[PDB]
């Protein structure tokens, strides 16, 4: 059949002007979107973006590409796209996206005798996802992919989620060590710029952050460094150097925790839920030092009192820290 | 220093013709541009970052530039969301600059970035004042 088909294709593309959309002067082109998510590869709090990989399929109808004779849907080489009209769909909020190239440009064209075109792309985008790190690392974020046409207004192009709620697939395939996808949402809107009104589709994820990493790397070091500070209460007041070692080292290892923990984030000007926890932990260790400094100030003047300060501290400090934890954790879970 | 025009899914560029003969040529561009900084009052500073727009080959004899809509030619300064800064104002300028190969048109977009100090109290002032 091979010669018959080359002609039917050649006639399709004889006189075909890629500069003109379907129904050029006429009604807008309904373009159907269909996404199959492969993976989210990365989520950066520092750059407030995430990197996404998807199969991006588009269906539209170009009457210029109808064929009656042939009894099947025609899958042609990807290179035909260069000599077809395709919709000018881009991602409004992307920082850098690219279309995979190996071994051939990862794009599909399937024609139907209808004239309906199926235009698939494999794309990885890194898109902006502004983050509210106020309840970090007990937070969740809403990352989106805004899909729009660059040049063609609502007078020329329409977008719709092909299959409605069921237009997007693959959210289950997302495997992030640090997050988990609680839900996703599809939206359809018209947005208005100076140059006119454009169609948009908005894909959204909600990422709930897993805290496992942060207990290991922050909460335990903080909680243990607070417990360490309060051991000095069980050492005789008279080893002044020993108990300054406990004081000074715990205070410095607290500042270093607060700084190193701040270094994995963007330079936001607010305090995170972790930053409070660490700040409070700093209070408990700095207090533990000042406590001893006071004990040492009475330790010959009024030795009875100094030893009572310790005996009180040995019980007040852990109880306050214990009850603080129960309030903090309840508040932020 | 390095700019590029977005490519996905198609080259992000628009052409709209008018029966007039008037052309509308839109591009989506990300540039990283030089912004010499006076860090003397850092981190209690502010900076003036610019985007100098010029034609490469064509002189004033062949090309003119103008901000379409005057003061209102630039939009989106409100959309800027930086953790570390805030935009106090912006300014549009129109000039002619003279090189050896002739006089060229330039437009200069400018921002004034006021730095937020929140990060620096947390990380450097408190550690210093507490260590004192």
């Amino acid at each position: 059949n091979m010669s018959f088909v080359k002609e039917t294709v050649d006639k399709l593309l004889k006189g075909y002007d890629i500069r003109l959309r379907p129904d050029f002067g006429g009604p807008p082109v309904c373009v159907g979107m269909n996404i199959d998510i492969a993976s989210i590869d990365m989520v950066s709090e520092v750059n407030m973006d995430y990197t996404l990989t998807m199969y991006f399929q588009q269906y539209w109808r170009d009457k210029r590409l109808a064929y009656s004779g042939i009894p099947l849907n025609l899958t042609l080489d990807n290179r035909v796209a260069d000599q077809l009209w395709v919709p000018d769909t881009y991602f409004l909020n992307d920082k850098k996206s690219f279309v995979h190239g190996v071994t051939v440009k990862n794009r599909m064209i399937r024609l139907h005798p209808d004239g309906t075109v199926l235009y698939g792309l494999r794309i990885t985008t890194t898109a902006a996802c502004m983050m509210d790190l106020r309840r970090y690392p007990l937070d969740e974020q809403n990352c989106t992919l805004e899909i729009e046409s660059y040049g063609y207004t609502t007078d020329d192009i329409e977008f719709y989620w092909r299959g409605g709620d069921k237009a997007v697939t693959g959210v289950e395939r997302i495997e992030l060590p640090q997050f988990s996808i609680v839900e996703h949402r599809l939206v359809s809107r018209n947005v208005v710029f100076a140059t006119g009104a454009y169609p948009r589709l908005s894909l959204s994820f909600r990422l709930k952050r897993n805290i496992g990493y942060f207990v290991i790397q922050t909460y335990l070091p903080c909680i243990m460094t607070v417990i360490l500070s309060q051991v000095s209460f069980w050492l005789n007041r008279e080893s002044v150097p020993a108990r300054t070692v406990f004081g000074v080292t715990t205070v410095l290892t607290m500042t270093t925790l607060s700084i190193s923990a701040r270094n994995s984030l963007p330079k936001v000007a607010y305090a995170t839920a972790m930053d409070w926890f660490i700040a409070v932990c700093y209070a408990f260790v700095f207090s533990a030092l000042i406590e001893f400094a006071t004990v040492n100030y009475f330790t010959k003047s009024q030795p009875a009192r100094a030893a009572k300060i310790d005996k009180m501290s040995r019980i007040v400090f852990p109880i306050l820290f214990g009850t603080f934890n129960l309030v903090y954790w309840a508040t932020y879970l | 220093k390095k700019s590029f025009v977005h490519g996905v899914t198609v080259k992000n560029r628009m052409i709209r013709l008018h029966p007039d003969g008037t052309v509308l040529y839109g591009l989506r561009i990300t540039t990283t541009a030089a912004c010499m900084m006076d860090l003397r009052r850092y981190p209690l500073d502010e900076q003036n970052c610019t985007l100098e727009i010029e034609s490469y080959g064509y002189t004033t004899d062949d090309i003119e530039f103008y901000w379409r809509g005057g003061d209102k030619a630039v939009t989106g300064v409100e959309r800027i969301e930086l953790p570390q800064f805030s935009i106090v104002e912006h300014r549009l300028v129109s000039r002619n600059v003279v090189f050896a190969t002739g006089a060229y048109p330039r437009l200069s977009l400018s921002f004034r970035l006021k730095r937020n100090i929140g990060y620096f109290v947390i990380q450097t002032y408190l550690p210093c004042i507490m260590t004192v």
Partner: nanobody
Amino acid sequence: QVQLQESGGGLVQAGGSLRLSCAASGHTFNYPIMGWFRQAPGKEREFVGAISWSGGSTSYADSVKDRFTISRDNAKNTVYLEMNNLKPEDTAVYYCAAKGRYSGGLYYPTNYDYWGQGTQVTV
């Protein structure tokens, strides 16, 4: 979602001043930009001005330029609109709106997702 409520609207004499407030609750982070619109009895809904999440950048209509000022206080989840040297042309129901992060141009009301039932200003 977001919920907006206004206050401060009332009767004022020409050349007078008035301060409108808009208190917000809910997901105010997802809708960073706040906008003011006014609707005269006969005329269509007009853009007054708007303000950014950081509060630094603003933008005003030409008619309202130089006589009004919009301010933000994220501490109280509230944006303010000070209207000075008021004219009878300013008479309208003043609305408070919140716009999504990627919702296009400021001027066009289509793009705002959440509104508050407005407060009346008569001059």
